[model samples]
Target: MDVPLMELSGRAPVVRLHDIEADMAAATDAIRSQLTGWGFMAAEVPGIGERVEAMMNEFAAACRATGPSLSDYAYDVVPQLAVGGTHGFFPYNSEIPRLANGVPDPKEFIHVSGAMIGDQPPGAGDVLRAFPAFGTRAAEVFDIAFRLISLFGEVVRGMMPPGTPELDLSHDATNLRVIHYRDVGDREVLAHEHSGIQMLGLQLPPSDQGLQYVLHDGTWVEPVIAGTDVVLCNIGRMLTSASDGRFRPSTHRVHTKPMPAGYERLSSVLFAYPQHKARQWKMVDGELMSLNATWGDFIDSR
Candidate 1:
């Protein structure tokens, strides 16, 4: 089933997924909406946002507990995992490289995420050693978050090109990250292009939150919100390649400005990456960019 790419390219890009009942027609509607609109859409996940929000509050309190004696406690605890499951404040500036007039510039901000494992919640035992009042609760939040991200993957697979084969979630791991932006008094610029991700689901403060991205016309769109859904999902480079570019990826950034004194911004996001063994390929210049590479290779490539 081929998607109507030309028409969608001219329209807006944001779509919603249905609850309980899966609707192909609606899925196409969703595909068209986001695929054409903002390369992102607010999807319905019922109670997810509400729950995650509460835990985010707990996380914020932990952030405040960074006194010298408990400096390390403020960082969410991490459980032993074969792969991911660490949580802490990741300062911006260099980790994610950006280009300004072809010059490399790093972003400025700090972000953190709870680690959730296949069977264990990230920061399991003594999770809240720093939280004092909310550490245990935070663990539950992390566990649910990872599962929610995985669920979103299933939802996207359902909406993928109809003939798409069954996707295996067992090998796919879910990740969540929370962002905290410094009061730079001006909007923060994230950047353009996909970062080789598969699918991204984000949850931030309700509407008018400072999220922006460049449009196809070479113009930067204004700040936008993803509605009341638990999270807003955008396609990623891996998915774009996996779909042969049918499921296009979108460019996004936290174009945030100063807020009231004592108030800050936190963006909770979930990244869904495919299994290491998953195959990916994309078309370019009327020819295929071939690869015998797996998802792991693509991930580590960057």
Candidate 2:
């Protein structure tokens, strides 16, 4: 079977959330086309971009302030932070192997559940204590993330056939990650190509422009964003499976050859997952196939 090629120009269809809210049927049609064609879209949601930018700047400043001691917050070094199933700081040298090369990815990052900040989970408190401002901003970002999930649910529900199970939004595995890609001096790959495990993923504008995605025809192209007001959203593995491959999961990566000296790239991403027990339906051979495994089970299986 011949695979369809994504737009070689790397232009993603832009959709405004407010418009979707006002006219769901029309917006759903646009969204369905975008998801099926590009597996990605530039989402215009008021205030989310500004909030995300603020959070990214603050996180970068906080990391800079920590200086040499930033290593102290590593997930392995501080096991307590990883308690309660939350991922903490992952240092550059951590075991994130690259598919392009066996070497560990040279990017350092920290993952925190923005939603958990509101309820204050046991392990999350420790992370908040280390960077209180980040937690505050993350909480703000979480609000938008929550809204995105709700809007996404509506879009997904709209696309499905009648009588499909309703998507549950009670429990979510959404997380915000602040990634720092430091200068590795001419490394070919910064982060290897891979699809996310979540249902949906949103990326705020990065400090640099190295992000690129692979087309079905084996070509890689960088997406062009006209401004920072829009958030880039992409389909993930779970959504692809739930839609019976009707939606394509984005396969993307970051790479910079002959990397500039003292170069640093900062980015914030929100990974959105449905509740663990949420039931999803997929169309298989003209029949509705119920996916019995919970979202958690699906993740574990992967």
Candidate 3:
């Protein structure tokens, strides 16, 4: 069967975060239908655009500096080996596969969590100290991300079956990642196709067009984000499993064939992971299947 490729063109559902406070029921219904049907939605998150733009501007300035390279501030995971975390800068050509294949992705990015900044994990402080402006901007973005995560949790809780325990909406393990897809001439893939492992993902508007997601029916959609105020929210593997397949997980990738010269794609994403105590239930057929494990256990296994 041949899969059809298409553009969003107002085909995807949209949810405004402010609606949650204005009309909780309506917002909940919107979220339920959008997530269960499309597995993704364009979210009108308040103040996210301004914060991300500020953060990205800071990053761009640092990158253009004549002296020190941004890679110099790369976080060293060696000291935090005992703790086990990958919160830091990863330069282009890093030996990490974007797909099942062993080839590394052709992009550079930084993974930062509020916990790392607040607790000052090993190399976190150094990065913050080096780029104070970026750090300040990132902190604001973190606040917005946490709010978005909590709001999403509230809607998701309402969508869950009655009598299900309260969902853990903690932002402890949530991370804000900024990816810079450099124009490395022509290539088959800029970032290979894959789904996220987090419970949810909030993607800020990319600087240039290149984001795409595949539907459950195998149709690929390229969404056109109009402005900075809008964010793309997608369900992840954790949410899919927790909802017992009631919610769909979005499979997405980034690629702009025959990339324009000096065209760099910059995007900010918040990966919201479930709390350590969070439990996931899976349903096989009409019955609930038992697989006793906390979200933390799942993370450890990864």
Candidate 4:
């Protein structure tokens, strides 16, 4: 049976294929219609496993690449990417923020789509120009990223309040972030409840675990994707604002277990944001809260 977001948001957030079989023709229609109740969902991305796996492996290698020191290019600290590129590698522990207890966060990640054109940092374009293969491989992943973002944009359109101008989410603000988390140590807190990012897509194999959602009833819901290759998606903080709080962002994080010594967590993430000048406002008590301000304003003041 198809579940309402209210009911599921309090206990679970998984949206199986059965939930949308009734209205798959226009997923945006179905998605927006239900955003007021549920803030997140999971759906299968059929036949995407192999392609995503290839991109993951390639990005992983790029992160592991070594070469010329970052100082050679006037960089104070080197990125974790390939020795030459600006955005490929970001090894663990560099620039990572500390937890409340001052413990270093156990994660190292890289951005593959930061500069909007995929070249990322200032000088990185020349590097990609030198090595066309890297650009091609990144394009393969970006193809999927753009397609998925388009899907999200469709839903965002449906999220607009009636009689408002079309809300545009296709911008160069946020990019796809590829992340790798080292295995949690004996006392490390891997992930926690938070709503900081805009959107997320994970390529977790069947045996993978650690993803969790905190339901409204205080229950921790675990989505089960036992037999399919699904790209788990969650709403982001900005989307919540753009939708006037109709489409909310969920509090989800990974709480990985310790041990196994060699297991590392890897996932590809695409964070969506509105255009720089796109106005954003929230509805409060049945009235618009403040004057419409650009997304850049929101981000700047934030």
Candidate 5:
């Protein structure tokens, strides 16, 4: 997606959205509204637990394949799995033993298990050190994320105007950035492109908060409201192009929350990039959509 402009806010604009609802109905309403608006709202919350489990299993498998740590071979894809259970495991709740009532620290950030496998950050020389065995497990996690995201994209496609092109989700790379919302001051990320699409996911701890937004010159409009167990997902410029001016790639940024002082935000975000690597013609594939031109020819014509 073509990255949009983020008008810089005087450092530490400390942006964030408040009001989280655990109620399924309320959360559903937000998603429903986007659907009604002919837009897409995706939540990574639904499958969080499942994906964690699968990742863990993969990590274990990697250990078996490559033997504990990989001191000998730095294979192609290091294997690492994060098992999903209650508040434990890889996303292990920093506050243990009923700390914050099962709420984790939003400040503590983590990436896809495969990412940190065998000491990669905070130690491990900040580079990949997973043994080859980790690849087997990482592949599983990657496939899961890909299909899960793709499925979510399909849902968006189904809701689009009938006869719309066969829209799809292009899962990009797993974003691994340590962004302490409650602590991070206002920051501006210049316009950047992520091929066709990009996905951003977050992990927040309890009693803490984080915020995200899209900048339109000066307007700090929020793309995803903070709350619920679900992860907020937004569309990118690539999607905007696919829409031929319909779906816009939202410009957004994040900072520590402003409300409820002392409510620190400990979290990590994943910028899930698109899976469809190359630029393809814009024409509606398989079925016709509300659109009128092919992506390929349209670019050439312009």
Candidate 6:
């Protein structure tokens, strides 16, 4: 029922920085550059890039037929997130929350998953349709974006809550996309209440961009700023469950605002939530006091 302001750090030592545009941009740019070169262990299927282009072209064709239609963020943007995000395609909660006789207090541990389902198809309809003018070049850009996120995620993985379960190259798989950005709009204060953000909570607009994509656990909040690319961060309830409610999942919301006269708002969020049974790394004392209870748990709980 509260909206967090400024920046607050989770975990134990409290080292996270908020309004971290500098770090965010640097991370974004570094990832972009790396993606341009050899990708980090991606599908080597021939024509993958070409196929993506082809599909993007199809999507572009679909767009042209509509004549400048406005777009908005959908829960699913990158098709790869089958097991990621708040309402993950695969629900991993199973039978963990019903109260068991011998369950550990604060829960023996909290966890989540980040296993993604689909891969970016080669020359799919949308790739061809979405950005035909740019042709193969555009597809390559999108490709780089996809792979960059994938690789940077590797770097980010090192920064997750420590001292619980760690990922190994051979064991951990790419289940969630933690960051992405796009522009679309459908600014409605009254009508969008049914939407996820509006329904979750009604808070103040973050900035002139008219909205924010943010999530929180306990007091820790991650809000995306407009005029800048969006970066999906983590949040989940497992932190509280594992901590015996010493910590709680922060309640967050995206504020609704009016769209520009002729322009609509577009957005894409990258999720680092737990899916595929990833559990939140317990943050005790010196541990990074992070939450989100693993990516898989984040998805199912939502």
Best by lDDT: 3
Tens-place lDDT per residue, model 6, 1-302, is: 24444321121111113322344444554433322221111112223334333433343343334542212112233233334333211111225532322421111110111221211332112322333453343334333333434333443333334553432221123222111111223523211111221001111111233232222222422343333222222222442443334322323333444455533222222222223554444546645445546545544555
The reply for model 5, stretches above 4 Å from the true place, is 1-32, 35-145, 159-208, 214-228, 257-266, 274-277, 283-302
Error of 4 at 111 (Å): 1.6
What tens digits encode model 4's per-residue C-alpha lDDT throughout 219-276? 5665554234555556776666755666667676655556577565666666655565
Over 1-302, each residue of candidate 3 has an lDDT whose tens digit, in order, gives: 13234444344334444454553344566666766666676555555567688787787666665655567766653123243346777766434434334656666777777666675455555666677898788777877766766666677766776654455655557788987766356675676777787778888766766678887677777766534566777778877777776777778887675756766567888888766665666545655555679776766666
Off by over 4 Å in 1: 1-28, 44-49, 66-163, 170-172, 183-196, 204-208, 215-219, 222-227, 277-291
lDDT accuracy of residue 27 in candidate 4: 54
Question: Candidate 5's residue-wise lDDT over 113-215, tens digit each?
Answer: 3234334333322223343333443444444444444444554455455665444433323433322232222322211222224432332211223234433
- Off by more than 4 A, model 6: 1-162, 167-208, 212-224, 229-234, 238-247, 260-262, 275-302
Q: Model 2 over residues 1-302: C-alpha lDDT tens digits?
A: 12222332223324454554554344566666665555665555554556777787777776787543555666664433222335567666434433334656666778766435644444444665667787788777766665665566667656766654555544335777788776466676778788788877877766666678765666677754323555667678887887788667888887654646756677878777776666666766655788677777777786
Residue 44 lDDT in candidate 2 = 51
Q: Alpha-carbon error at 265 in model 2, in Å?
A: 0.3
Worst 10 residues of 4 by lDDT: 1-10
Identify the leading candidate in terms of TM-score.
Answer: 3
- Model 4 CA deviation exceeding 4 Å by range: 1-25, 29-37, 68-89, 94-103, 114-122, 126-135, 197-207, 225-227, 282-292
Task: Please report, as a residue range, the 10-residue window in candidate 6 with the lowest summed lDDT.
Answer: 197-206
Error of 6 at 134 (Å): 9.2
lDDT of 1 by residue, 16-89 (tens): 23332343234446644554655555444555556556656665555565552223423333344454424444
Better of 3 and 5 by lDDT: 3
* lDDT of all predictions: 0.48, 0.63, 0.67, 0.51, 0.36, 0.30
By summed lDDT, which 10 consecutive residues of candidate 2 come out lowest? Answer: 1-10
Pick the winner on TM-score between candidates 3 and 6.
Answer: 3
Q: Could you arrange the candidates by TM-score from highest to lowest?
A: 3, 2, 4, 1, 5, 6
How many pairs in model 2 have backbone atoms within 3 A of each other, for residues 3 or more apart or on separate chains, i.e. clashes? 0
